[PDB]
Amino acid sequence: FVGGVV
Ligand SMILES: OC(C(F)(F)F)C(F)(F)F
Ligand SMILES: OC(C(F)(F)F)C(F)(F)F
Ligand SMILES: OC(C(F)(F)F)C(F)(F)F
Ligand SMILES: OC(C(F)(F)F)C(F)(F)F
Sorted by sequence, the CB contacts under 8 Å of residue 4 that are 6+ apart come out as none
SS3 letters for 1-6?
CCCCCC
Expressed in angstroms and rounded, the spacing between residue 1 Cα and the centre of ligand 2 is 12
Tell which residues of the chain come right before a gap with C–N over 2.5 A: none
Determination approach: X-ray
State how far Cα 6 lies from the chain centre: 8
Largest CA distance in the chain: 16
Number of the ligand 2 atom closest to the C-alpha atom of 4 = 5
In this structure, which residue's CA is closest to atom 3 in ligand 1? 1
Nominal resolution (angstroms): 1.1
Distance CA(1)–CA(6), nearest Å, equals 16
